[PDB]
Design a protein around this ligand. Structure first.
Ligand SMILES: *[C@@H]1O[C@H](CO)[C@@H](O[C@@H]2O[C@H](CO)[C@@H](O)[C@H](O)[C@H]2NC(C)=O)[C@H](O)[C@H]1NC(C)=O
Ligand SMILES: *[C@@H]1O[C@H](CO)[C@@H](O[C@@H]2O[C@H](CO)[C@@H](O)[C@H](O)[C@H]2NC(C)=O)[C@H](O)[C@H]1NC(C)=O
Ligand SMILES: *[C@@H]1O[C@H](CO)[C@@H](O[C@@H]2O[C@H](CO)[C@@H](O)[C@H](O)[C@H]2NC(C)=O)[C@H](O)[C@H]1NC(C)=O
Ligand SMILES: *[C@@H]1O[C@H](CO)[C@@H](O[C@@H]2O[C@H](CO)[C@@H](O)[C@H](O)[C@H]2NC(C)=O)[C@H](O)[C@H]1NC(C)=O
Ligand SMILES: *[C@@H]1O[C@H](CO)[C@@H](O)[C@H](O)[C@H]1NC(C)=O
Ligand SMILES: *[C@@H]1O[C@H](CO)[C@@H](O)[C@H](O)[C@H]1NC(C)=O
Ligand SMILES: *[C@@H]1O[C@H](CO)[C@@H](O)[C@H](O)[C@H]1NC(C)=O
Ligand SMILES: *[C@@H]1O[C@H](CO)[C@@H](O)[C@H](O)[C@H]1NC(C)=O
Ligand SMILES: *[C@@H]1O[C@H](CO)[C@@H](O)[C@H](O)[C@H]1NC(C)=O
Ligand SMILES: *[C@@H]1O[C@H](CO)[C@@H](O)[C@H](O)[C@H]1NC(C)=O
Ligand SMILES: *[C@@H]1O[C@H](CO)[C@@H](O)[C@H](O)[C@H]1NC(C)=O
Ligand SMILES: *[C@@H]1O[C@H](CO)[C@@H](O)[C@H](O)[C@H]1NC(C)=O
Ligand SMILES: *[C@@H]1O[C@H](CO)[C@@H](O)[C@H](O)[C@H]1NC(C)=O
Ligand SMILES: *[C@@H]1O[C@H](CO)[C@@H](O)[C@H](O)[C@H]1NC(C)=O
Ligand SMILES: *[C@@H]1O[C@H](CO)[C@@H](O)[C@H](O)[C@H]1NC(C)=O
Lengths: 143, 454, 142, 448, 452, 135
C-alpha cells in the first residue's frame, strides 16, 4: 500500500516507487472522481467566503507543489521517469559509504537526513549536466 | 565501479509540516436536514473505507501538545461558530432598563428566586412606538443597576448580543479530518500511548476516525475510550500548572434533565427580526440536575487513583476536591444538552480522600441554566440561546476528565487533584493525540553504478 | 476551420488539426485573464464584493485542474507531450464490433463518444495496466 | 487485430452546468459609467465577435431546462441587491403621516390618486426634528382607523435606491469561461426545443438587454419568418406560452407631470429624495399603441395559435385575471419610474375568424416589491421632468383559458410574472457544453 | 540553410502591470504594535536581499506612467478602509453641543482655538442618557443657530464619523514591494536620473528597498535622499498644471511639537463601544509648532534655486511665495505625528526672492484637527482620538513639492508656490527607480540543426 | 550570474543561463501570520490571483512547448525552415553582436506565424509517425 515500504531498506524500498509517486497530487483525479464534492458542497464553500478561500489556497498549493516537482524532473532530463541514471559523478563529500551500506542496512528516511545538506548542490549539478547534454545534442544535430 | 547520482520519484520520505486540512463526514445528508453546522461544513463524503496501511519497522515521534491539528480544529470551530451566528437577529434593542420581580410560580426551594420575571419597554428603533413586553430571564443573565428593582443584561456593558438562529443546530455529529493531496496522516496504534515520545506500531491513514466536536469543561463527553487501561497524560506532570488530561477505559453514564416545561414567546423586533423570549413555565418549577450512577463513578475514580499512584508513588495520599473560584465557564461542568446550556456544580463528584493503604443510589449534581453565553471566553461577542420547548433530557458518556494539581509544598504528603481546564484545546487533544500530519516529498537522490546514455 | 469546426467532420478528417482545441484550453484562460486585468482597470469593481472574485478564481482553478487531470492521464499512459499516441492495449470487439472503415469514415466523434461511453473507464484501466507493465520492464532493463 | 489510440484535442462536448461571466460593450462605459450593469460587466467584449459555423452538426436544445436562465436570474437579483446594499435605509420614514387630498387642478382620472403628506423626520443632529411634506401615490399609503402610514411601514425593510445609480437596461453578453463553449441554434421557426440543424459555436452570446416586464416583453429581439409560439406543453394549460413577434409594435408611454425632486437630509450623509410640488396640471400616466399595428399583431398570433388547436378553432382574448398589481398589469421601469399599465384594452377581441391609437391608463407606485419577495422593498426616487418612453414590444406572454369542455372558443389572457420567462424569451438559442478533448478509438498500429 | 529553433528560458521581458504583494524586514513583534503596516503585511523579506546587475542593458523608465504608484495608492486606501472598518462608529456624537471658550491659562496665540463642549450622549442602555464634556479644536466644530453658543461637529451634514481604533498605530514602517512569480522589478541606478529618460546601470531585484508610506502635503518627510545634487523632476517642466517634485541631497532637520499635556477620557456609548474625548490640559496652553534650522533651510533653498536656474535659465528671478488659497489639506503642511494630525502653515519658509545676487529657527505655527476627511474623500471622516502626554516628532525633510505660477508676461520674475495634495506624488519620489516587467521566456531564433 | 544575469549578453552567450531563467518562473518568492492574510479585501484573492496567474502563464508556455513538438527540453530544433522574410540577417550577426531583447523586438510581429508553422509541423510529424508505426 501507500508508504508500505517506508521502514524497509532502500534497496527493497525502491520497488514501491510507482505507488507513492502516483499518489502525488492524487487529488487532481480524486476530487474529479468525487465530482468536486456534491453540488451543495460547492454552495457551502462559496457562501462562506473564508472556507472557500482556505480550500482554494489548499488546492492551489497542491497544484504548485506538483508543478514544481515536475519542473525539477523535466529540467534534469528525467521527465516521465520514476528511475533515471544521470551524468553526474558522485562526490565523496556528500557520502563516502560503501554501496551495500547505502542500498542495504538503511531506510530512505535515514539516508534523506544523511544527505540533507547536499541536496541543492546535487540539483544544481544535475541541471548543469542536462543543459550541457542538450547543447551537445544540438551540436550533434547540426553535425 | 564509480558512483553516479540517480534521481528517484516516489521515495517514501516525509517531513513534519503544518498544512491546511479539509473536514469530511459521512454522507448521511438526510440527518439534521443539513441544518446542522457540521453538516453544511465537513460536507465532502467519507464513504471509502479507511486505509490503515501498517508501516513495518517504522518508529515515529509524536507530540500531542504541539500538534498542528489541535490549533487548526480550534480555529475552525471558532470560525464556523462565528459564521453561523453572524447572519442572525441582533438583539441590541433589548439592552434596556429591565424592571423585574421574582417568579413565585410554585417554585421549590431549590429554584427560589432563580428565575426573574422581567418586563421592559421594547422598541424597534425604527419609529416612535413603544410596546411593553415581558420575559422570564434566568438570574445569571440579569444584574442589578441601582444597587420592583431595575436590572440590565450582563452583556450590556461588555458587548452587543446576537441571537442564535433557531434553524441552526449545533449538535456535535461525528466528523473526520482528511489531509489534502500530497500530505498524509500518521496515527500511533500503540495501546496505552502516553502522549509523546516514539511510537512503534504506526499506520498511515488519509482520514482520522470520527471525532465528535463536543464542547464541555471538567468532564469530556462522548469521546473515545482507552484500550483496556485508564491513561493519564500531561506535558510536564511534575509541573502543577499543566492540566492533567485523563482518559478512561470505561464510560460513566450521566442523565441530565431540565424538568421545567417552558414555552416560547415570539416578539417581533423588525422586518423579520424575531426575538424569542421565555414564556410562562407550565407546572411546578424544579431545579435542573444531572444523575451520575454512584457505584460506576466510585469504581472509575478508584481506577484513576491507581493510575495516579503509578506516577506519584503508591504511598502518597491522593485527595480529590471541588474546583477553585473563578467564572462559571471554568468552576463548573458546562455543556450544550439538547440545545440548552447547562452549568453543573461538580463538588459532589471530586469529593473523596484515598488512603494509599488499599446500590441504586445516584449522585445528584445541581445545574444552573444560562441563556446568554460568552462563548470561548472571548470579550466582545455574546450569544443568546433561544428557549427550547418541552422537558430536555440528555444521556451522555463521560469518556474522560481534566484534572489540575495543587502542589503540597515540598513535603508532598498529600497531593490534591481538582477538576479544571477551560482551555478548549485540551478537549480536542483527547481525540487528536494519536495523529500527526506529515508532508510527503517523493523526490530523492542516491548513488549507484550506472551512466546516463546520450 | 475553427475551435470546433471539425465537430461535424468524420473522425478521420477531424483528427487532422487537433492542435486548435488543445491550445485553446489554456489560450482562453490566459486571454480572459489578460482582458480582465489591465484592460478595463475597474479591478475594485470585481473585488466590490468577495463573491464575484471567488467565483471567477474558483472557475480558473477548476479549469487548470481539469487540464492537469488530462495531462496526468496522458502521462500515466506513456503519452505525455503527444496529441496522438499508439498503445499496446488490443481493441475488444465487445466495446464496438464496427471495423475501421465503418467508424473512421461516415461517423462523427460525438457519435463515437455516445457509442462507447460505457467502456471508457475500462479502456483507461487497461491503459494504466499496460503502462505500468512497460515501466516495470524499463526498470528491469536498467 | 486493432489497438487502442488516445487522442487529445478531439472535438467533442457534453451538456454541462457552469458559471458564466458577464461582458458588455466598453464603448458605452463612459456614457453609462454609473449604470449597474456597466459597473458590474466591466470585462470588455470582442469589438467584432466571430462565430464558428459547425457544418453537418445536429444538436438538441431545450430552453425550458436551460441553466443559463437560472444563472441570469440569480445574477440579476444579486446585482440589484448589491446596488441597493450601500444606499440609505428609509426606516426613519415609518411615522404617522398627516395627509390631505391634492385637489389642485387635477383631472377626473387622478381624483384621490395622489396624497399630500406631512410628517416629522429626523435631521442631521440626532436630537432635532423637522416637519417636511411630500407627495405619495395612493398605492404607497394605508389609512389608519387623515393619519396614514406606508404600505410596509412596520413589516418590510424599505431601502432607497441611490439616485445617481442608473437602472437603464444596456446590452450584456454572457461569455463562457475557458474550457467551455456556447452552441447557438440558428434554425428559423425554432419552436424552443428539440433537434436543431443550423448550429454554430460562440464564445459570447449576442447582446441581451436585461429588461424587466410582466405581461409584454420590451426591447427584445424579433423572430425570423412568422410569429413563433413556444411552450413546454401547448396542450397543458398550466404552462405559459411565450410568443415572439416578427414585427415590433411601438409603444409611447409618458408621465405628463413636471415633478421636482425635493432633497431632504435624514442624518449624516443620508438624503431622502421626496416628490415635491407638481408643476403644471396633473394628468394620468398612459401608454399609446398603434391600433392597426396591434390588431394585425393579434391577428398573426391568432393565426399561428390556430395551428396547435384546429382550423375551426375560435380564439378570443380576455384581460388579466385577479391578483396582485405586480402580476395583473403590465409593469416596466422605463425612465427610472415603475409604471403599472392596465392592459385590458389590448386583450378584448374574439378572433373567431379573420392613425387611431389605444390609450392604456397607467398607475405609478414608488415602493416596489421587486422579484415577488415579501419583507423587502425598494423606494424608487422620483424623476424630475416629464418622462417620455418609447419601446418596442417583441414578445407576449399569454395563458390559454383552462376550458374543461371542448373550449372550441380558446381564450388567451395575459399571465406571466415569472422573470425566468422574460430572461428565457431571448436566452433560448443557447446552451453551455463542456469540452472533453480526450478520447479514444481503435487503429491498426500498436506501440513499437 | 537556417532552421527555426525554440528556446525556453530566454532572458527577455516586456512592460506589464500586476499586483505586487507587501513585505517587511524582520518586523518580528517589536514593530508589530498592532501596526497596520506590520500585522497585515505578514510576508517577510529576505534577510539577504538579492540584486543582480545587468551589464550592457538600457531601458526606458517613466515615473509618471509607473503603475507601481497607482497600486501603492490603492493598497494604502484599501488598507485604511479595512483598518477603520471594525472600529466604533461615532454617529451618537452628532448632537447639539453647548460650547464655551477655554480660558484656563491660555496664551494669546491659541485664543479661540480650543473649545469646551458639553452635550448629551447615550449609554449602554438605550433608555438612559449622560451629560458629558469634551474639548474640541476650532476646525472640528462649526457654529449653528447664529441668529451663538450651540455648535455641531463639522461632519454632521456630510458624512458619518468613524473613530480610529485605539492601540492601532498608523506609524509608517518600511515596506518592500516584491514582484510575484514570473515578473521582475528593474531598478535604475543612474545618478541624477530626471525620471523619464533612458537609464543605464540597470539592476534587477526581487523586492524594492524600504519604502516608508508617509502621508504629507507640500513637503516630503522621511524619504530617500538624492546623491551628489538636488534633482528636479516634472512630467512637463513648461506645463503650469504639473507639479515639480524636488528631491534634496541633504535632509533638513525639522522638529514638530504639541506642547500641551493632554489627558484622555473614556466614555461608553453602547454595548462595549467606547468613545475617547480630550479631557483636560494639565499645564498651560501653547500652539503646536514646528522648528526648522534657519541656516540649513537657507542653504537648501539656495541649492534648489541653483538647480532651477538650469531648467529656467541662469538669468531668471526665482521668487518663492506661500501657498495659494484652498482647504487646509492643500494649502498647509499636513502630516501624521505620533497619531495626531498636524496642519502647519509654511509661509515662513517660502518667502525668498533670488536674483543671482546663526542658530535661529523658523517657528512655523501649526493647527491640530481631529475630524479628518482623509484621501480627499467626503464619504467618510475618521476621528483621530487624542493622545496622552506631549508629542514630539523629529523627522527629516527629503523633498519639496513646487507648483510654478503662470508668469506668461514679464517672465523675468517667475514665482514658485508649494502645492501637491495628490498623495501619488508622495510616493512617486520613492518609486521613480522601479519598473515592473513580465518575463517572456519563450523565443525563437535561426540555427543550423534540424530534427531527425 | 543569477536571474537575468545575461540579459545584456549576446544571444549565444546568454543561452547558457536558460536553466536558472526557467527555474525562477514558477518558484516565486512566497512559498508570517495567516490570520491577517485571509482578509478578502487585501492580502487575499489578489495574492491568490497572482499565484494562479503565474501558474497559468507557466502552463501556457509548457503546453505550447508540448504542442510544438519540443516537450521537456529547453533547447530544441524543428522542421520549419527559417524564412528570409522574418529576418534577412545571418548567424554571425545574430548569435554575436546582438542581445536577446533586440532580437525579440526585431521579429516581434512574425511570432504568431512562426507558432502556427511549428504546430502544423509537429502535427504532420505525429501523423507520419502513426502511419509509419502502422506500416
Ligand atoms: C457534409 O456532408 C456532406 C455529405 O456527406 C458532404 O458532401 C460531400 O459528401 C461526399 C460523401 O458522400 C464527399 O465525398 C464529398 O467530399 C463531400 N463534399 C462535397 C462538396 O461533395 C459535405 O462535405 C459535408 N460537410 C462538412 C463535413 O463540412
Ligand atoms: C395618446 O393618446 C391620447 C388620445 O389620442 C392622447 O391624449 C390626448 O387625447 C385627446 C383626445 O381625448 C387629444 O385631443 C390630445 O391631443 C391627446 N394628447 C395630446 C394633446 O397630445 C395622448 O397625447 C397620446 N399620448 C401619447 C404620449 O402618446
Ligand atoms: C528628462 O530627461 C529627458 C531626456 O533624458 C528629457 O526628454 C528629452 O527632451 C529633449 C528636449 O531638449 C528632447 O530633444 C529629447 O528627445 C527628449 N528625450 C526623451 C527620452 O524624452 C525630458 O524633457 C527631461 N524632463 C525633465 C522634467 O527634465
Ligand atoms: C549635497 O550637495 C552639496 C552641494 O553640492 C554638496 O556640497 C558641496 O557643495 C559645493 C558648492 O556648494 C560643491 O562645490 C562641492 O562639490 C559639493 N561637495 C561635493 C562632495 O561635491 C554635498 O557634499 C552633497 N552631499 C552629499 C551627501 O552628496
Ligand atoms: C524488520 O526488521 C526485521 C529484523 O529485525 C526483519 O526480519 C523484518 O523483515 C523487517 N521488516 C520490514 C521489512 O520492515
Ligand atoms: C425575591 O425574593 C427575595 C427573597 O425573599 C427578596 O429578597 C426579593 O426582594 C424578592 N424580589 C422580588 C422582586 O420579589
Ligand atoms: C511519556 O513517555 C516518554 C518515554 O519516551 C517519557 O519521556 C515522557 O516523560 C512520558 N510522558 C508522560 C506524560 O508520561
Ligand atoms: C451503458 O449501456 C447502456 C445500454 O445497455 C446505456 O443505457 C447506458 O447509457 C450506457 N452508459 C453510458 C454511461 O453511456
Ligand atoms: C424597434 O423596431 C424598429 C422597426 O420598426 C427598429 O428599426 C428599431 O431598431 C427597434 N428599436 C428597438 C429599441 O428595439
Ligand atoms: C412577419 O411574417 C409575416 C408572415 O408570417 C409577413 O407577412 C410579415 O411581412 C413579416 N413581418 C413584417 C411586418 O414584414
Ligand atoms: C411615438 O413617438 C414617436 C416619436 O418619438 C413617433 O414617431 C411615433 O409616431 C409615435 N407613435 C405612437 C404610437 O405614439
Ligand atoms: C418644469 O417647471 C420648470 C420651472 O423652471 C420649467 O422651467 C420647466 O420647463 C418645466 N418643465 C416642464 C416641461 O413642465
Ligand atoms: C383587424 O384585422 C382583421 C383582419 O385580420 C380585421 O378583420 C378586423 O376588422 C381588424 N380590426 C380592427 C379593429 O382593426
Ligand atoms: C508641455 O507643455 C507645453 C506648455 O508649456 C505644451 O505646449 C506641450 O505640448 C507639452 N508637451 C507635453 C509632451 O506634455
Ligand atoms: C514588424 O516588424 C518589422 C521588423 O521589426 C518592422 O520593420 C515593421 O515595422 C513591423 N510592423 C509593424 C506594423 O509594426
Amino acid at each position: 500500500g501507500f508508504l508500505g515500504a517506508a521502514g524497509s531498506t532502500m534497496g527493497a524500498a525502491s520497488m514501491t516507487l510507482t505507488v507513492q509517486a502516483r499518489n502525488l497530487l492524487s487529488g487532481i483525479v480524486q476530487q474529479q472522481s468525487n465530482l468536486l464534492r456534491a453540488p451543495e458542497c460547492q454552495q457551502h464553500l462559496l457562501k462562506l467566503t473564508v472556507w472557500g478561500i482556505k480550500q482554494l489556497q489548499a488546492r492551489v498549493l497542491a497544484v504548485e507543489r506538483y508543478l514544481r516537482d515536475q519542473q525539477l524532473l523535466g529540467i534534469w532530463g528525467c521527465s516521465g521517469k520514476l528511475i533515471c541514471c544521470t551524468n553526474v559523478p558522485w562526490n565523496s563529500t556528500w557520502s563516502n559509504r560503501n554501496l551495500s551500506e547505502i542500498w542495504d542496512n538503511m531506510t530512505w528516511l535515514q539516508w534523506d537526513k544523511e544527505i540533507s545538506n547536499y541536496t541543492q548542490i546535487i540539483y544544481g549539478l544535475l541541471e548543469e549536466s542536462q543543459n550541457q547534454q542538450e547543447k551537445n545534442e544540438q551540436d550533434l544535430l547540426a553535425l | 565501479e564509480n558512483l553516479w547520482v540517480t534521481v528517484y520519484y516516489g521515495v517514501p520520505v516525509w517531513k513534519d509540516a503544518e498544512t491546511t486540512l479539509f473536514c469530511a463526514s459521512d454522507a448521511k445528508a438526510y440527518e439534521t436536514k443539513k441544518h446542522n453546522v457540521w453538516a453544511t461544513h465537513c460536507c465532502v463524503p467519507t464513504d471509502p473505507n479507511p486505509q490503515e496501511i501498517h508501516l513495518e519497522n517504522v518508529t515515529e515521534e509524536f507530540n500531542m501538545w504541539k500538534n498542528n491539528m489541535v490549533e487548526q480544529m480550534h480555529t475552525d470551530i471558532i470560525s464556523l461558530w462565528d459564521q453561523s451566528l453572524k447572519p442572525c437577529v441582533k438583539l441590541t434593542p433589548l439592552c434596556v432598563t429591565l424592571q423585574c420581580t421574582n417568579v413565585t410560580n410554585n417554585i421549590t426551594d431549590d429554584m427560589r428566586g432563580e428565575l426573574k420575571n422581567c418586563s421592559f419597554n421594547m422598541t424597534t428603533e425604527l419609529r416612535d412606538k413603544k410596546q411593553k413586553v415581558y420575559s422570564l430571564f434566568y438570574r445569571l443573565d440579569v444584574v442589578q443597576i441601582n444597587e420592583n428593582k431595575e436590572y440590565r443584561l450582563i452583556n450590556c456593558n461588555t458587548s452587543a448580543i446576537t441571537q442564535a438562529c433557531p434553524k441552526v443546530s449545533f449538535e456535535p455529529i461525528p466528523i473526520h479530518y482528511c489531509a489534502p493531496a500530497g500530505f498524509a496522516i500518521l496515527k500511533c496504534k500503540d495501546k496505552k500511548f502516553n502522549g509523546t515520545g516514539p511510537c512503534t506500531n504506526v499506520s498511515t491513514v488519509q482520514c482520522t476516525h470520527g471525532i465528535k466536536p463536543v464542547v464541555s469543561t471538567q468532564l469530556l463527553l462522548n469521546g473515545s475510550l482507552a484500550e483496556e487501561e485508564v491513561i493519564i497524560r500531561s506535558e510536564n506532570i511534575t509541573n502543577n500548572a499543566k492540566n492533567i488530561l485523563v482518559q478512561l477505559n470505561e464510560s460513566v453514564q450521566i442523565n441530565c434533565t431540565r424538568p421545567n416545561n417552558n414555552t416560547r414567546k415570539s416578539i417581533r423586533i423588525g422586518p423579520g427580526q424575531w426575538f424569542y423570549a421565555t414564556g410562562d413555565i407550565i407546572g411546578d418549577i424544579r431545579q435542573a440536575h444531572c444523575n451520575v450512577s454512584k457505584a460506576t463513578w466510585n469504581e472509575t475514580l478508584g481506577k484513576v487513583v491507581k493510575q495516579l499512584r503509578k506516577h506519584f508513588g503508591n504511598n502518597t495520599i491522593i485527595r480529590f476536591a471541588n474546583s477553585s473560584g473563578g467564572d462559571l465557564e471554568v468552576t463548573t461542568h458546562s455543556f450544550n444538552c439538547g440545545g440548552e446550556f447547562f452549568y453543573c456544580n461538580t463538588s459532589g463528584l471530586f469529593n473523596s480522600t484515598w488512603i494509599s493503604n488499599t446500590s441504586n443510589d445516584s449522585i445528584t449534581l445541581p445545574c444552573r441554566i444560562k441563556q446568554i453565553i460568552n462563548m470561548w471566553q472571548r470579550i466582545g461577542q455574546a450569544m443568546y440561546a433561544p428557549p427550547i420547548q418541552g422537558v430536555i433530557r440528555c444521556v451522555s458518556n463521560i469518556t474522560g476528565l481534566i484534572l489540575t494539581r495543587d502542589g503540597g509544598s515540598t513535603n508532598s504528603t498529600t497531593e490534591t487533584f481538582r477538576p479544571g481546564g477551560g482551555d478548549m484545546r485540551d478537549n480536542w487533544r483527547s481525540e487528536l493525540y494519536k495523529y500527526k500530519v506529515v508532508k510527503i516529498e517523493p523526490l530523492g537522490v542516491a548513488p549507484t553504478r550506472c551512466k546516463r546514455r546520450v
